[PDB]
Design a protein around this nucleic acid. Structure first.
Ligand SMILES: [Mg+2]
Ligand SMILES: [Mg+2]
Ligand SMILES: [Mg+2]
Ligand SMILES: [Mg+2]
Ligand SMILES: [Mg+2]
Ligand SMILES: [Mg+2]
Ligand SMILES: [Mg+2]
Ligand SMILES: [Mg+2]
Ligand SMILES: [Mg+2]
Ligand SMILES: [Mg+2]
Ligand SMILES: [Mg+2]
Ligand SMILES: [Mg+2]
Ligand SMILES: [Mg+2]
Ligand SMILES: [Mg+2]
Ligand SMILES: [Mg+2]
Ligand SMILES: [Mg+2]
Ligand SMILES: [Mg+2]
Ligand SMILES: [Mg+2]
Ligand SMILES: [Mg+2]
Ligand SMILES: [Mg+2]
Ligand SMILES: [Mg+2]
Ligand SMILES: [Mg+2]
Ligand SMILES: [Mg+2]
Ligand SMILES: [Mg+2]
Ligand SMILES: [Mg+2]
Ligand SMILES: [Mg+2]
Ligand SMILES: [Mg+2]
Ligand SMILES: [Mg+2]
Ligand SMILES: [Mg+2]
Ligand SMILES: [Mg+2]
Ligand SMILES: [Mg+2]
Ligand SMILES: [Mg+2]
Ligand SMILES: [Mg+2]
Ligand SMILES: [Mg+2]
Ligand SMILES: [Mg+2]
Ligand SMILES: [Mg+2]
Ligand SMILES: [Mg+2]
Ligand SMILES: [Mg+2]
Ligand SMILES: [Mg+2]
Ligand SMILES: [Mg+2]
Ligand SMILES: [Mg+2]
Ligand SMILES: [Mg+2]
Ligand SMILES: [Mg+2]
Ligand SMILES: [Mg+2]
Ligand SMILES: [Mg+2]
Ligand SMILES: [Mg+2]
Lengths: 181, 261
RNA sequence: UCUUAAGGUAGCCAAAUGCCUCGUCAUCUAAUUAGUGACGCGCAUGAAUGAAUUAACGAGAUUCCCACUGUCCCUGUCUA
RNA sequence: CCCGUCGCUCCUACCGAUUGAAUGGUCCGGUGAAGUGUUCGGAUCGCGGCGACGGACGUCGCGAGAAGUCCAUUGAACCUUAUCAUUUAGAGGAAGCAGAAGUCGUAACAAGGUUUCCGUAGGUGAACCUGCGGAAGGAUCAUUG
RNA sequence: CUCCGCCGGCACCUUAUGAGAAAUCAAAGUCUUUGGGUUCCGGGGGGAGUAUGGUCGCAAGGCUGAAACUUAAAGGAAUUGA
RNA sequence: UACCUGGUUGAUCCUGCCAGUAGUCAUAUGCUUGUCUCAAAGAUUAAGCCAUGCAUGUGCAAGUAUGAACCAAUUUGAACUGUGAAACUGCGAAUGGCUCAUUAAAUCAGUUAUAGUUUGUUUGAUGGUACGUGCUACUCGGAUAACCGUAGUAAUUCUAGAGCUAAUACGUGCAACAAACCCCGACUUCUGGGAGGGGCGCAUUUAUUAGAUAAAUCCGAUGAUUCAUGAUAACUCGACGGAUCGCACGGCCUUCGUGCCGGCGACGCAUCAUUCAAAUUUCUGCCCUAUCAACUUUCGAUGGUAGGAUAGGGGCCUACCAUGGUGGUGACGGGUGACGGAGAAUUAGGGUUCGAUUCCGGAGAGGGAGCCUGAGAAACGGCUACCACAUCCAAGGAAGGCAGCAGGCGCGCAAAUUACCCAAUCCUGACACGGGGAGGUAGUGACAAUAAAUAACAAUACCGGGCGCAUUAGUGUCUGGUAAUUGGAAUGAGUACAAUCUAAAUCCCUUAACGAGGAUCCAUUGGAGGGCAAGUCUGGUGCCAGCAGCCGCGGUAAUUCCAGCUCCAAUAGCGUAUAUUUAAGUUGUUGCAGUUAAAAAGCUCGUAGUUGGACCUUGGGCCGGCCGGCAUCGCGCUCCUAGCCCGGCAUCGUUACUUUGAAGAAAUUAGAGUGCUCAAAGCAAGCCAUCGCUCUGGAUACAUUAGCAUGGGAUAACAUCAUAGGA
């Protein structure tokens, strides 16, 4: 049976100490302020953060003049700068270590939509994303966690179909017009 | 088992075919032929995979049953015929010719050529020895056996072979100072020049080969194949001139092609 | 509590020693007053009256099992 | 605060006559299917000589060749004895544990009212006691007083 | 017999700059700044140094030595009281 | 994330465990459940047992067609024509699928070898003589299917007899030189000869011989061969050396005669090479156990010689001979709920545990065994026998093997449909075409894994903190919320055209018309004394019922039970049980302990094991910008690399250690590129005028040990200059 060979993986890890106030309120800080559905959203981000930090930490144990150091470091640094997760002049691969969970949560499609306007709240933005109401370059991206890159940041906008930035009206809008007529 | 094996499951196929692990459960099993089925490329791959003259296993079947495809001078109907190093693949309907040689990354390429390079191939001799009634003959690594060669062609040497008259038309005496292309290992494809050969009584001998641009590498004598006498080749080297490189260098090349684009 | 010189100790047992008695329990059997192992208010066991064991041995007593067979079912026949 | 015998209830394991029981394996011995090869065998079947005879015969030509059979070899399988291992029954004997609102004492912790304890040995309802040697974990870091 | 020095012993006293849970210890010191060499041995309390097999012994016994099961503590040093 | 908290006490500091706390590509179970993508699934106990159905057949222009049909249909000389079914012939069915019972250096892995073997097929080369007294080819045999027809048996791809007819089935039989050399050898002359005519393809077996050196005409290969190969003498009751089949025509007569030719091909036989492979085979490596210290050897155990057998080496087997082989570095024996690896879970590092399962290797087909055919099988969707189990019978007999796919029973804590298709991947056959329970597609599927709904925005508000007056005020700022308050906007869950999808279907992705007031299109599972996040609420009970992993709660005012209310955590998921990992520095190599907490043997000797003082220049420097290349008081070079007399030479001790490289299956791990809308994934795709094509990619790394090669030669091993038997 082929298709057994397809891979699948895990994206988040549950916390070791279930019930501690200081960790627990800090989590609600992030969840509420970024408009998240559940703690799983935040845990996967931290799991992905830990992946690169282990990667970046491992290279930093290697030395300069190391081909793996040079090749792997630049690719990681490009990946960070490409998503904007690292400021300018920050190209030292010691500042990847300083990176936080806030930054990844400020590149999400949900958060960038609110920071650009268009929404009037973080929680409006999300339902505005899942209701086919926002394209990115030319495609209707309907995942609140899209993780927008810098080059695509300019073209984030309304759809060419969505009543608020596209074409014809919605079901309730047409319903009210027909009952008036 | 109680006999031969007729199936090749895809995960077990040679890595240099670049077959994709979800494209099916099996692979083309290379038929018995002039090449050793792990250093070959069958015909099915060449047509459907690389050239895309076909979309399915059945379509490549039909093409050969029209007989458009010729290999090494002769028309081959076999689907999984084991084409190899320095074969010629020619399609007179399209009027195109190919030599089969390696990338620097060790994968077969169909190297497009004229007619005048289709007339001949190169082969290294496996051995030269007497035979029936003392009639000298030689083994190549292409299965071929040529009787009555020059008494100069010794073992490991390389021969030019006209596909029309079929006998030796030239030969290179394998030794230090000629250009070679490597046909196995991690160094396969990398061309260069024999700088030294150190033998070891009762083992394989090691060849020392240096890229035109300084880089030095070594193989064992099995994976060596002289192309030309001296620095110059007698065949057309592929899209990269047999010079292998660090991963940084091709990273630099793209962005260098990405600064002009 | 009466009493004795001392009140049968370690052990052993329905034993060649137990009346009751064909003791009770188990085992061997189709069926066992027989046998072996236990039990012990032992009519009436018991320490050189030697107590308890015990390999080897025995024309010593006893129970069972395999083989064997006119011992028997059930007699017939042959020789001197 | 605390120890042990004993009485009652339950749980677990131990010894145990019973040539105990069951199951599976192995060593040897006995019998030994079928095949394979070997030896005879020769049903009948192919020039169907010849005699040059009158579809018929025998002298026949050698070559095929079945059933059977002979000796070897592999060898299932069955049976006896043995052995091994894993389960399982047992009169009776005897350990540990736990429970409970029980009986007898008072062994230990204070100099615990005989300081405690270790080895060995003997004795006694029980905890224990006593002899011999040892230890302080002693109730003495001390006699020039 | 008196004084001084060296070596090797049995110890004692005073003190940490040391260690330790502490009592204490100049060796129980030179341990999370963890590595001189090597032998034996422990892994909560019981059951138990018991059962069984082996082996040594005249015997008493020695050496080797479980398990089923049970239980939240058992234990060490020091403090205040009684 | 290299982490701990509750429980011994009146309190304290320890030891030490119990308990909590996280995961599992790790199973079952419970409650719950809307969408998209993805995919494990009768392994665990029973390698237990099977009703039924399927899983292996096959045909080209190119072996054989009046046997009976079909379509041309004949001018009735020749055709069975062109297409064919059946059938004989050839090939295949030894692969794949399934499972993990036996199996503990065994299978297996990395790494070797075959000069010790077989190898249908592919690819390449190669091929004379058969008898003729080698003085150039010497002739054509019956009988069997499909079919016709008689039958037996209850019986089934059980079976008999008669009548025909084919061959690339079967059996015969023509064969190509100088014969190139070699042996006889009438006579000739004397021979060193000329010689008249008699004896010689290739295979096979044996024997003899050739296959050459070393400096003052020898000439193939290997590290190494009586090697490759040649010559000779014979030997075989020789497997062999074409009586085969297609189209296409198209040069020209010799009798102008299918006329002499001569092509490309299909199949076939034989030797060598190659390829697809195996078979053995070297070195190193595997869990627990000594309450398993000896095992093997008569009758093969260890070796020798000669045989036999094999494809071939070998005690593989036989006869004779010797007395060996293994073992505290653990033999032998036992356990394994033990196939091995690639791998998996967990991971600060070091580790611990798992690995039936889709890739590779092995093994088996109810248990044993023995075979036929074939290149290849000790084959089981082949046979033969026995053991067990069972089916039919007309009672004489006959037929068996789901650890293949589906399905049923049983067993269990524990697992899906008796579905569609060869469209993809490939395989197979005589084959472009047939077939494929391989394999793919769909139904069941909360095994695991991904993304992601269950509302958003506004103003009213009895109100509530700041912030504008802060005084005295009051409201008003982010709306924080009871608010079935109110107002329209957003949309998919759903449902439905079509299109797409697909082998055909369905699902997804697109998308006409419907699809929201909160009662509904309503989210649940565990908790609320502590550990541990969240009640000094209210009713019931009264050491009962119950809860409680642990500590504990309950005896009439229960923060712990039973309930309502409210809150807490996670959330389309969560709880429970069991194994395992972490925590555990409570297995301690890194890295624990042993005075009193558990723990120094009564004491000394001693073999193995483990460990072991110092010392032998690379020291004092020239040289050019880490290092070459060198001089000091650097044992040689003839032989290969060898500078314009010269660096940089190989054997006359062995190794570990380190350095670099080779060669290392993929999948998995890490890691580059790439906007599957994101992600888990995949290995793609991206630009062009997202126009007759351009540009491509499909990197790279780790890989413990063992083996191979390269430099270093600090450290550390074993061996060894005093009979001088030294240079
Ligand atoms: Mg093939
Ligand atoms: Mg008495
Ligand atoms: Mg009596
Ligand atoms: Mg009797
Ligand atoms: Mg008696
Ligand atoms: Mg008396
Ligand atoms: Mg008396
Ligand atoms: Mg008496
Ligand atoms: Mg007597
Ligand atoms: Mg007292
Ligand atoms: Mg006292
Ligand atoms: Mg005392
Ligand atoms: Mg006394
Ligand atoms: Mg002194
Ligand atoms: Mg422990
Ligand atoms: Mg203990
Ligand atoms: Mg004590
Ligand atoms: Mg105390
Ligand atoms: Mg740790
Ligand atoms: Mg206490
Ligand atoms: Mg208390
Ligand atoms: Mg625990
Ligand atoms: Mg197979
Ligand atoms: Mg051939
Ligand atoms: Mg021998
Ligand atoms: Mg021999
Ligand atoms: Mg097993
Ligand atoms: Mg199993
Ligand atoms: Mg079965
Ligand atoms: Mg088999
Ligand atoms: Mg079989
Ligand atoms: Mg079957
Ligand atoms: Mg099945
Ligand atoms: Mg609730
Ligand atoms: Mg509760
Ligand atoms: Mg709690
Ligand atoms: Mg709390
Ligand atoms: Mg609970
Ligand atoms: Mg308690
Ligand atoms: Mg509670
Ligand atoms: Mg409650
Ligand atoms: Mg400890
Ligand atoms: Mg102690
Ligand atoms: Mg001592
Ligand atoms: Mg020693
Ligand atoms: Mg080595």
């Amino acid at each position: 049976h082929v298709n057994f060979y397809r891979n699948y993986g895990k994206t988040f890890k549950k916390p070791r100490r279930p019930y501690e106030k200081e960790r627990l309120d800090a989590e609600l800080k992030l969840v509420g302020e970024y408009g998240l559905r559940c703690k799983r959203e935040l845990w996967r981000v931290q799991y992905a953060l830990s992946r690169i930090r282990n990667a970046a930490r491992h290279l930093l144990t290697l030395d300069e003049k190391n081909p793996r150091r040079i090749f792997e470091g630049a690719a990681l640094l490009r990946r960070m700068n490409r998503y904007g997760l690292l400021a300018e002049g920050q190209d030292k691969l010691d500042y990847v270590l300083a990176l936080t969970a806030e930054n990844f949560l400020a590149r999400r499609l949900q958060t960038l939509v609110f920071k650009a306007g268009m929404a009037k709240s973080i929680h409006h933005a999300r339902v505005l994303i899942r209701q086919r109401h926002i394209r990115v370059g030319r495609q209707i991206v309907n995942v609140p966690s899209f993780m927008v890159r810098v080059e695509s940041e300019k073209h984030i906008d309304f759809s060419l179909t969505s009543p608020f930035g596209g074409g014809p009206a919605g079901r309730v809008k047409r319903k009210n017009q027909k009952k008036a007529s | 088992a109680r006999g031969l094996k007729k199936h090749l499951k895809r995960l077990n196929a040679p890595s240099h075919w670049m077959l994709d692990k979800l494209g099916g459960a099996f692979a083309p099993k290379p038929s018995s032929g002039p090449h050793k089925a792990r250093e070959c490329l069958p015909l099915i791959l060449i047509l459907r995979n690389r050239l895309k003259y076909a979309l399915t296993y059945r379509e490549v079947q039909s093409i050969l049953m029209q007989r458009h495809i010729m290999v090494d001078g002769k028309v081959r109907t076999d689907k999984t015929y084991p084409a190899g190093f320095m074969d010629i693949i020619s399609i007179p309907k399209t009027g195109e010719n190919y030599r089969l040689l390696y990338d620097t990354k060790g994968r077969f390429r169909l190297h497009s050529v004229r007619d005048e390079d289709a007339k001949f191939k190169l082969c290294k001799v496996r051995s030269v020895q007497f035979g029936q009634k003392g009639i000298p003959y030689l083994n190549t690594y292409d299965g071929r056996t040529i009787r009555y060669p020059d008494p100069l062609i010794k073992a490991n040497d390389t021969i030019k072979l006209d596909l029309e008259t079929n006998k030796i038309v030239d030969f290179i005496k394998f030794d230090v100072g000629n250009v070679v292309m490597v046909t196995g290992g991690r160094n396969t494809g990398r061309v260069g020049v024999i700088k030294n050969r150190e033998k070891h009584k009762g083992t394989f001998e090691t060849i020392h080969v240096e890229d035109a641009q300084g880089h030095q590498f070594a193989t064992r004598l099995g994976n060596v194949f002289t192309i030309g006498k001296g620095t110059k080749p007698w065949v057309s080297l592929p899209k990269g001139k047999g010079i292998k490189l660090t991963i940084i260098e091709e990273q630099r090349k793209r962005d260098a092609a990405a600064q002009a684009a």
